[PDB]
Design a binder for this molecule. Sequence first.
Ligand SMILES: *[C@@H]1O[C@H](CO)[C@@H](O[C@@H]2O[C@H](CO)[C@@H](O)[C@H](O)[C@H]2NC(C)=O)[C@H](O)[C@H]1NC(C)=O
Ligand SMILES: *[C@@H]1O[C@H](CO)[C@@H](O[C@@H]2O[C@H](CO)[C@@H](O)[C@H](O)[C@H]2NC(C)=O)[C@H](O)[C@H]1NC(C)=O
Ligand SMILES: *[C@@H]1O[C@H](CO)[C@@H](O[C@@H]2O[C@H](CO)[C@@H](O)[C@H](O)[C@H]2NC(C)=O)[C@H](O)[C@H]1NC(C)=O
Ligand SMILES: *[C@@H]1O[C@H](CO)[C@@H](O[C@@H]2O[C@H](CO)[C@@H](O)[C@H](O)[C@H]2NC(C)=O)[C@H](O)[C@H]1NC(C)=O
Ligand SMILES: *[C@@H]1O[C@H](CO)[C@@H](O[C@@H]2O[C@H](CO)[C@@H](O)[C@H](O)[C@H]2NC(C)=O)[C@H](O)[C@H]1NC(C)=O
Ligand SMILES: *[C@@H]1O[C@H](CO)[C@@H](O)[C@H](O)[C@H]1NC(C)=O
Lengths: 170, 50, 106
Amino acid sequence: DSTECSNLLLQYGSFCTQLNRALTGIAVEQDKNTQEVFAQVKQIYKTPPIKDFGGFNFSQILPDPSKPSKRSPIEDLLFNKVTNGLTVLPPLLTDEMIAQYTSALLAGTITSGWTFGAGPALQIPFPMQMAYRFNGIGVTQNVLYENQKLIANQFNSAIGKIQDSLSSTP
Amino acid sequence: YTMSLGAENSVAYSNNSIAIPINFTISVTTEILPVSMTKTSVDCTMYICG
Amino acid sequence: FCGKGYHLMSFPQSAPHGVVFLHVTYVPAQEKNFTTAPAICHDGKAHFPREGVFVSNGTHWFVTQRNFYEPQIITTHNTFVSGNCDVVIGIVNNTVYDPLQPELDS
Ligand SMILES: *[C@@H]1O[C@H](CO)[C@@H](O[C@@H]2O[C@H](CO)[C@@H](O)[C@H](O)[C@H]2NC(C)=O)[C@H](O)[C@H]1NC(C)=O
Ligand SMILES: *[C@@H]1O[C@H](CO)[C@@H](O[C@@H]2O[C@H](CO)[C@@H](O)[C@H](O)[C@H]2NC(C)=O)[C@H](O)[C@H]1NC(C)=O
Ligand SMILES: *[C@@H]1O[C@H](CO)[C@@H](O[C@@H]2O[C@H](CO)[C@@H](O)[C@H](O)[C@H]2NC(C)=O)[C@H](O)[C@H]1NC(C)=O
Ligand SMILES: *[C@@H]1O[C@H](CO)[C@@H](O[C@@H]2O[C@H](CO)[C@@H](O)[C@H](O)[C@H]2NC(C)=O)[C@H](O)[C@H]1NC(C)=O
Ligand SMILES: *[C@@H]1O[C@H](CO)[C@@H](O[C@@H]2O[C@H](CO)[C@@H](O)[C@H](O)[C@H]2NC(C)=O)[C@H](O)[C@H]1NC(C)=O
Ligand SMILES: *[C@@H]1O[C@H](CO)[C@@H](O)[C@H](O)[C@H]1NC(C)=O
């Protein structure tokens, strides 16, 4: 708050304007980065109330209604595991809205596959979508359909192992 | 106001229904990417000392 | 990477200190609901689509390409056979036409 110091600082010119402008550019750049990563859909997709996905369980990645933050158990675990002229500006997107964006992306990729990323969201059953993905990597649809229960069990086990691994590794 | 993330769109998911497009739109979009800057040279001796 | 939608082609345009890409993409439109099945049960055998998907408009079953509605008769060239009908969940009963059948029939 020294007037004399500011008067002497004005002898050095527009250094302070440059530093403020650079920090402002960084601060808007962080919001732009968050928009670029998470705000890639202009439609907020929602999952159906009945979670009938042909044996596939997405409870660990879908938002939990019981939590006030509306986060997934994995996202809740991730948030729990991360702990003189200076001001900290809040981010433009709050944590609940970022979680809502991830929820919309999850609902789009579960209910519509990749159709929502290229245009309107076209509904498709999740086993059929998985069969399409199997064809993408060069495996025939029959392999997915015949071993659908095994694939769903392996997927659920892997998702549970992911949650356990995140909870168990510092 | 509190910013709206987007319009709500509940996809009608069921275990035996698919949505098939009957038409298409040929969409042309623009993407602007900077490539170069203005090439500036500063004479250090002349800038500092003239 | 090259526009919103399924990328078809792109055109470069010069700009002051920059480039403008005109991305020509294919966007699906005017979608319609259809009843779908993973496989077709015929003669105790399971038929799966080679490149498309089985769709039903209510009474008849067809196979169509995934990105455009073009219903075609379920034959033996557009599908492949793997196993019986007892394993696939949600297989439906429908006839499968044979192109060779009128030839030996006549
Ligand atoms: C999907 O997975 C969740 C958890 O991964 C299952 O919830 C469990 O259900 C059993 C019995 O219903 C309980 O004993 C567990 O405590 C539950 N776990 C959790 C973390 O809540 C759920 O049943 C699975 N299936 C469906 C259809 O949601
Ligand atoms: C496919 O069918 C579903 C339900 O049979 C349609 O979903 C409904 O669409 C109307 C029109 O906007 C909504 O008012 C309803 O709330 C929707 N219901 C559900 C359960 O989502 C869907 O629009 C149909 N698809 C097409 C392309 O017509
Ligand atoms: C697919 O969409 C195109 C437009 O995107 C439709 O073409 C229009 O058809 C109407 C009547 O058939 C004409 O009045 C318009 O002038 C046409 N527009 C253009 C740009 O050609 C076309 O008919 C649609 N096809 C189907 C099968 O729905
Ligand atoms: C589903 O599609 C098939 C084929 O396009 C329809 O069958 C035809 O329906 C027309 C309309 O009356 C008849 O003139 C033809 O003779 C039918 N073809 C055959 C081979 O029977 C069928 O009607 C459609 N179903 C629905 C519910 O729209
Ligand atoms: C599809 O066709 C098969 C055989 O034509 C049906 O299987 C029969 O189902 C009845 C009733 O459950 C049994 O009594 C027969 O023994 C079955 N036969 C065989 C060879 O499995 C099947 O039910 C049909 N599915 C539908 C949806 O109509
Ligand atoms: C789809 O769900 C209905 C109940 O809503 C059930 O009767 C039917 O068998 C299911 N089909 C498949 C393929 O899971």
